[PDB]
Structures are given as C-alpha cells and as structure tokens.
Amino acid sequence: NLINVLSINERCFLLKQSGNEKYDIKNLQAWKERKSVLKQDDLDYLIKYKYESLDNFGLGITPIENFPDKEVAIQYIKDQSWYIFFESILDSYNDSEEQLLEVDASYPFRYFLQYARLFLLDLNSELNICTKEFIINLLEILTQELIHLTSKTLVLDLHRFIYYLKKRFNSKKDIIAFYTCYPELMRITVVRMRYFLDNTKQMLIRVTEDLPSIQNCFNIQSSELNSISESQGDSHSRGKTVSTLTFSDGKKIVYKPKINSENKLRDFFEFLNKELEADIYIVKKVTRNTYFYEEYIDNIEINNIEEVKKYYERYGKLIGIAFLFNVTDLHYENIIAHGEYPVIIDNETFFQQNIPIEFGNSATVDAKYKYLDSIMVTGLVPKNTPIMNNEKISFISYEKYIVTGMKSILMKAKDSKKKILAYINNNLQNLIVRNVIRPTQRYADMLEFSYHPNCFSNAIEREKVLHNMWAYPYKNKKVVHYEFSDLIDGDIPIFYNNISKTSLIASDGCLVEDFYQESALNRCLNKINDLCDEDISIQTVWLEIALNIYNPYKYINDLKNQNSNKYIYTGLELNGKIIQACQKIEKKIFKRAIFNKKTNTVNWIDIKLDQDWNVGILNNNMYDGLPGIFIFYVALKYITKNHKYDYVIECIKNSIYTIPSEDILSAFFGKGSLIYPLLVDYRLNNDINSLNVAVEIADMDWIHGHNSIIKVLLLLSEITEDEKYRKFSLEIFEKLSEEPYFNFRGFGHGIYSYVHLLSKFNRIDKANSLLHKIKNNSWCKGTVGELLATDINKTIEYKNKDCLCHGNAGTLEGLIQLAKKDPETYQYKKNKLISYMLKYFEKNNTLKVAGSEYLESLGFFVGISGVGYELLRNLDSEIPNALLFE
Ligand SMILES: Nc1ncnc2c1ncn2[C@@H]1O[C@H](COP(=O)(O)O)[C@@H](O)[C@H]1O
Ligand SMILES: [Zn+2]
C-alpha cells in the first residue's frame, strides 16, 4: 500500500518513466465529477501551473493496483529522506519499558517519543541549558502534536480503549503495518518529527548563545531552562511555534521564532510616545535576525477608578495609532491589561495593504474601500480586561475616554504630518511586516479536513482536498501554490512584505513579485498626508457606533445659536438666499461624492438608520438612498445649470441602474423606488430615457407598505395613458384592509395616506367615513400628514429639525399649500419659516438633520437632499410635491 503516499506529480513522473502515457480516462471522469467549489477558471489555473497539462494530471491520478512497475516505485519511496528517517526511528527503539512517562494513549508513538528523548538528552549534555523537567515538557508537546494529528485516523481505524492500543500497536512490524496502511499519515508524522527536533535544537542553541543578553535584558539570574508551555497549535515555516520559557528561578520569557522588525518597531513606538503622546507600553525584547525573545506580560490588577479612565484613554490612543499606520489583525481579545496599561504583544501587522481580492470596478465598491480604510479593520474595536478587586472592569461607562483617547491622537497626528512622514521615510522604508492574506481559521479548517483518514490513506485524496484553496478570489493566484506547500508540509501559511515593495515573501523566502499594485509605504504616506477633519469625524462616528453611544442629534443639539439675531428676508432677497443655500447643499454633497472615472458611477458613504444607526453606502431606497440625491440634482437642473450637474446625474443613473437591488413591489426599497424620480425627471427636463426606464421597472403603511406603490402606479397611467397601471393598483387596494399598519396618526405611518388614495380612486364620501370615526406635527406621524391629505398654527410652527419626514421642510410643504389656498394669511408665515431655516443654516454651516460634523444625512426624507429639493420647489411649483408623490 506504501505507493499510495505518491503525489499526483510523482505518480505522473513514474508512469512516464514506465514507458506509459495512455491513462484510463474513466477515473478522470470519476474525479472530474466530485463535489467541488472550483470554478472552471480555478481548475484551469491549478491544472496548468501545478501540473503541466490535463494529460499529466490524468496520468498522475492512476489508482492503486493498476500501477505498472511497483518495485521501482517502492524503491523511489524508500529512497526518500523521510522514509529513511522512519527506518532509523524504528531500528533505534529499545525493549525495556520503565523510564518514559506512563500517562498514555501515547503508546502508538512510543517509538518516536523515545527517539526524541535520546536526541534531547544528547543535545543538553552538550549545551547544559535545560533541566529534565524541561525535556519532560518538550516530550509532552510532541506527544500532544502526534495525538492530535492521528486522532481522526484512530477513531475510524477501530472498524476500554487501551485494548485497541495494546492490540493495534504491540510490535515493530505491527506499527509498520498501521503506517503503511496510512502512508500519508506516516510521511507527515516523520515530517513533523523532523521539524520538532530541528526547531527545539535550534531554540536551545539560540538560548545558549543569547543567554547573557537574556539575563541582562530581563533581569534573570538563572542559567537554566526549566519549563516550556503555551505552545499554540499555530505553526509556520517548518513547524515553528511560539512558546513561553520558564527559567529555574521562575522568570519567564516568550520565544518567538519569526521574521521580525522588532528593533525598528521599538524606535517607532518611542518616536510616537514623544511626538504624539501615544503613551504605548514598550515591551522589553532581545531581538535577533529571524527570531526574538519577549518580556512575559501578565494581567496585573489595576488599583483605582482614576487608573481605569487612564487605561481606556490609552486604549483609545492605540486605536488612533492603529488607524494611522494601517494596522490590521490586532484583536481586542489578545490585548493584555497590564495594570493601567493595555499592552500589545503582537505588532507584526503594522503598515498593511488591502488584500488583492477581486471586486467590481464601480464607485460603489470603491466606497467599500473606505471601510477597509477605517478603524473597524484594525481588530481593536469591539486577559484583555483591567481587573480591580478580582472584578473585571469592561468599557461600560468608560466609552467616553476611549473616544477622547482616539480623537486626541488623530488630531495631534494631523498637526504633526511632516514629522510623521519624515520619520517613516527616515527609518521605515524597508520595514518587514507580516500579511494575513486569508484568515487563519480558514487555513486551520482546511488543515483538519486534510487530516481525514481518507486523506492519510491516499496522498492523491489529501491533495484534492487541498485543491479547494484555488477557489479563493485572489487577483494573483500564484500565491496559492505557497499556501498549498505550507499545508501539505502541515503548517499554517505565512507571508511577509517589505513595505516599500509590492511583492510577498513566502514562508520559504521565495518572492511573489507584483502581488500588490501600490506599496504599503505609499498607502500610509498618503493616508497621513491626506488626513483631515472629515476623516477624524467619520472615525469618531464608527467608534461611537461600535461602543453603542452614538447620538444622531448630539451634533445639532450641541450648537449654540443664540436668540434674537437675524430676521425675515424680503420676497426678492429670499429667492437669492434660497439659490445660494441650495448651492451650499449641492457642494456638501459633491465633496462627499465617490466617483469612479472608469465606469462613470458615483456613490456616497453616510450614517443611516435601520433599527440601529450604522455607517453604510447609499443603495436603492427612496427614504435615505440614491434616488433621494438623484431627484435633488434633477430639481437643481430644472433651474440651472446644464454644466457640472449633467456629468453627475449620469453617474447617479449608472449606479441606480447597476447595483444589488430588489425587484420588490414598493415605492421605497428596491428598483421600484426609482419610478417617481424618473417621472419627475421626465416632467421637468426632456429625457424620454428616464420615462423609458420608468416603464420597464413597472412591468415587474405608506412607508414600508403598499399605499405608496399604489399611488405611483396611478401617476404612470396618467403620463402614458395606458390604464394597465390603474387596474394594477385597484387590485392591490381592493384587498388592502382599512386598519392602518401602524397606530400613529399621520401620512406614511398612519391612516391619512389611505385617505389620500380614496380621493385618487374617485371614491370620496366613503373616504370621509374614516375621517369621521376617530373624533406630532410631523409628516410621517403628526398633523402635517393630516394637513396634506386634506389647529393650523400648531402644525405650521418652527421646530429644531429641518428634514422632510418630520421637520421644517415638511412643514414648508404645508405652508406652500396653505399659501396657495390663502396667500394673505400664509405667504408671510411661509417666508418666515424659510428665513429662519436659511439663517440657522448660514450661522451653523449645517442644517438641523441627523448625522455629525461634516457628515449630515444626505437622504431625501431625513437628509439635506430633500431640504434642498423643498427649498427649490418654493422657487417654482413645477417641482412636484414628492411628499405624497405628485
Ligand atoms: N510577551 C508576551 N507576554 C505574555 N504572553 C504572551 C506574550 N507573547 C505572546 N503571549 C501569549 O502567547 C500567545 C500568542 O502567541 P503569538 O500569537 O505568536 O503572539 C497568546 O496566548 C499570548 O497570550
Ligand atoms: Zn419621520
């Protein structure tokens, strides 16, 4: 069975050498149809670059006994370094059974364990650097590795436990029998064995050589290692693992056998402490070329509440620092709370770049990049909790201090651009950092699957299980060859990067050139160079949202606007003030616009509400999405000008047409929300095209319900004469019950929207019957709702909100109406409201809407696009009343 250890390439080679090439073909078909997530392109990639061709692969897949020249294949296997090493381990073993530990289930590996023990004894007799306890610990670690590796195989190799171990593993040949039964388990076992011996020997030689520096740096009096522990299953670069080492005086260091730049990082942190008052805890290290030793950092108790505030401020600072220098993979679980200091113990992932995954080329995926450029990607934003009187102190009621910590770092750094940029260029151009290009858990899962008895019975089978790695959407898949090589080798893949280059350094030191397009160094220089108040502001929002302390109105509530200052504008100068205000609104919108020059698309990042407030990208819903901004530019075009706004309205149409949206039958949410604004675009400007698109969509309680969609359907009939729509809505309205979906008393979220439909479906009087059987201020609930469907001074009063949905612009629609029905009573009150809104606009340089500084809601119903729209309607009533869709 030994020939089953052969890999596809190895099988392919021997067959060619056997004077053979015509492979069965039938088993290629048997392989080609198996459950796989590999797409055709993936398969094409793998077949060509891992194997020469599809023929070779077909040849390399030949099963067991169908194999010619078995002896010459066996001789090939027996010539392999790992096979020879397996022989030596078997032949070296000794009959005695009285020295090595009896805490068992490790019976199967006693051969490996003894061989490891004698190797370690011989080594220490030379080095004199550890004790017998330490060697005991080392063997437990090897034992646990072999246990874990072979366990899945054990459970099925059955088909009280000591009986099977006694039986199945009793003699030399009987152990050879189990390993020849699973010859891929045998190969990897010996591979892991060799790694274990080499890494331990290498470790012990390093500690012996580095000892005077270790003693001096860490104030350790002892000259002998006594204990090794905490060896996480996370191994890299030929079985290398982090370990905690305890000396015979009880003092501990952490051994990290990793490529590193710890000396540059220390000088960097010191710079940051001086320049940015970063107050980073500097962890003591003895740094060497391809490894380092680190100070053992424990979770020491914090003394008082005054220190807890300091702790969480410092935490906010670390977040600011992580943002500024593109830190990823930090993980807030893993911070060590060292008294009043949060301590990072892994800092190998500064200066990162986005993984070159495949994404579309729209403005709306480019908009996704700004999240990947935020505080959220650092790993630091929710042994890591401070502890006071055996009590864990979470961030609850300390959120404020984290926010302040972060803000102060970002503000100070903004003022220190040139010093930061000069440091980086002076000291860090060749920084080597790690890149996690695929999450560890994915790699871990893959490895476990590859440990299936079926993978261990036939290398070919293990190889195929790993073939799945080729499914991942890397732009450059040349990297997967290296992941595969770590994983068959039994390791988690690991990659490094010099921050000024665009290549990846693979686990064996090989380069993958042109992996990145821009260097990590430049990405950070620019972020630093470009750092502005707007960025600080959005990072504060992200954070406050994450800490669950975001207030959508905090920003407007905290403005000081005085009492008796500024007054009512005259008819003529009020028109001049409206246009200026709409230009201010447009410009606020454009400044936050994300353009993609390539596809002529645009999108925005904005704070939006969906049960909670979250930062998001604008999608196709009327309430707070892209149709909102669309209709506003439409209206602004109706006046003037063509230029500027043409090359933006196209971009907006491109996005709305071509993004993940619904087919839903609704006038809010999904492509069905695009109807009205397209009709309005048709009715105000020429554009048949918007009407063309408008009709295409149509073929497929007011908010959230159907009421609104019924209403726009009627608009369609009207503009196209085609009564297929009026009947469409009739059907829906006939089954639509009389009770409102919500108990509120308004339009959109109450009974008044239903009312309006009846007086559109001709059937008045019976509309008045509901108006009869019942007998704040907003359009959505409240009286402006009631007003527009059909105590005036209450409903027309100024409020400290400006939006359409439940603010002054909605009130302004009520006034626009009343002042048409009765100019003498209302034309002045109307101009009063407009003037108050414009005056506060001017003074505050913002409108009274949800959001934060530099980040006003952009939406139609709660944002500034609707306010601009309403203001424009006042200038020309040809702009229809969107509030009830006309
Ligand atoms: N300098 C250190 N002090 C204390 N514990 C550490 C240190 N470095 C690593 N560890 C621990 O060892 C494990 C991490 O190894 P690594 O992921 O390579 O940093 C975690 O469980 C840490 O708690
Ligand atoms: Zn509302």
TrEMBL record:
Query: Which keywords describe this protein according to UniProt?
Result: Metal-binding, Nucleotide-binding, Zinc
Which InterPro entries does the entry mention?
A: 6hp_glycosidase-like_sf, LANC-like, Lant_dehyd, Lanti_2_LanM
Entries under Pfam families matching the protein: DUF4135, LANC_like
* Source species, domain of life: Bacteria
> What does the entry list as the binding residues for Zn(2+)?
C780, C805, H806
Q: Which residues form the Lantibiotic biosynthesis protein dehydration domain?
A: 182-497
Q: CDD domains, from UniProt?
A: LanM-like
GO annotations under biological process?
carbohydrate metabolic process; peptide modification
Q: What Gene Ontology molecular function terms does this protein carry?
A: metal ion binding; nucleotide binding
Residue positions binding AMP: K256, E294, E295, I297
Q: List the NCBIfam families.
A: lanti_2_LanM
Name of the protein: CylM
